[PDB]
């Protein structure tokens, strides 16, 4: 019995193997976006640090 929380079963979930796990960086986007130009090139699996223990109950059985 495991539900796998589908929401945060989307986003980053894919596993790596024998190195480091992914994440999501997430900036602000949306409106008034007329400035900045760096994270503009930095968005996807923005690694957090190591807090990927919570997320597991999100999914971990036949993706």
């Amino acid at each position: 019995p495991k539900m796998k929380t589908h929401k945060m079963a989307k986003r980053r979930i894919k596993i790596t193997g024998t190195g480091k796990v992914m994440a999501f960086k997430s900036g602000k986007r949306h409106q008034n976006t007329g400035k900045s130009g760096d994270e503009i090139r930095g968005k996807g699996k923005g690694f957090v640090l190591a807090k990927a223990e919570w997320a597991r109950m999100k999914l971990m059985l036949p993706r």
Binding site: K7, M8, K10, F24, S26, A55, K58
Partner: protein
């Protein structure tokens, strides 16, 4: 007989290692406050952490239906001395014969030998390997 011994037929043969541990039963030995009685331990049901935060925030990206992801045949010990047991039917050792969802190609290059395969694939990965190893073209679907 039975003067100064104790056994009479082995089974007494112990072992050379172990396996179990110490176990616990929760709430034991006549002591210990242990853990927090407030909700936890019993029932709980929802996870033993915070809640449903930092799950929210992302705009969410759909497309997760089965569709297709394929696997691989590793490509390394197949195009050498391997002759005939790898058609798209008899090859069922690492889940290959399982039809429907494609197997593409994906191989390296160079190639100093050759083999034969009931291919049913034309990926752009093994472009550096699709003839060097050998085995027609024939597109299927």
């Amino acid at each position: 007989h039975d003067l100064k011994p104790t056994p009479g037929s082995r089974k007494d043969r112990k072992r050379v290692g172990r396996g179990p541990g110490g176990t616990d039963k929760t709430a034991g030995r006549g002591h210990k406050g242990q853990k927090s009685r407030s909700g936890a331990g019993k029932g709980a049901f929802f996870e033993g952490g915070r809640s449903r935060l930092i799950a929210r925030l992302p705009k969410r990206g759909f497309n997760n239906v089965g569709t297709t992801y394929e696997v691989v045949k590793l490509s390394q010990l197949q195009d050498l001395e391997d002759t005939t047991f790898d058609r798209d039917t008899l090859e069922a050792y690492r889940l290959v014969r399982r039809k429907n969802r494609p197997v593409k190609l994906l191989a390296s290059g160079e190639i100093s030998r050759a083999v034969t395969v009931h291919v049913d694939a034309a990926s752009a990965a093994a472009i550096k390997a699709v003839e060097a190893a050998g085995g027609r073209v024939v597109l299927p679907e």
